[PDB]
Amino acid sequence: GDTTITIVGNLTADPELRFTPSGAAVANFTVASTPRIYDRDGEALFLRCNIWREAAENVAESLTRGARVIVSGRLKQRTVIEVEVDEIGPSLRYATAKVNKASRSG
Template identity: 30%
Template structure:
């Protein structure tokens, strides 16, 4: 049976990315992103609920995160949920869930470390494993006005 494992996260980094260089020379970056939602509870009190998501990026995405991301920056990450099993110091089996990013977009202006170099942005935007520049906004078409004459003005 086939399934879909896709996650989309848009939030702020809780810390600077932690970079590890592998023996092969590749890189892995780990960081946490916070997402928040606000609502009013039954008592009429405003509540903010924050979730923390562990993000893992490899190779090109790791290089970009290392270079451009820092604590507090806004980032958009698409990826897959991964569960890792490990044994703690007491011999107990533990499980950790994280999101392995497959694409990332830096959100915000220069203050949020967005990439401005057109050569870099275009080379990263060509695949889903690198930086994807923000798409241009799509103009909203004008509303279709329907005359009350039996539908003679239908656009089809």
């Protein structure tokens, strides 16, 4: 099946979490990927992404508009094309970040 894709770019805007008929969360956001040109950054590819499970609660509590991210997903369709994120992460090319999750909250 595969037809997987890795996309690196910035978030067009703060994620948008959804919870539809099943009580399930869907972190929506579109990744904007800029290329590289040369004649003497140019134009961008905007990719509407979807991320589920509690992988979306983090993708919400962690990422925000303008955030550069690395997205590993799969290309699905139904007239548009969207990536069903399997993995998402804040690219440390131009930033830092504290991590982990196992204890705390109550």
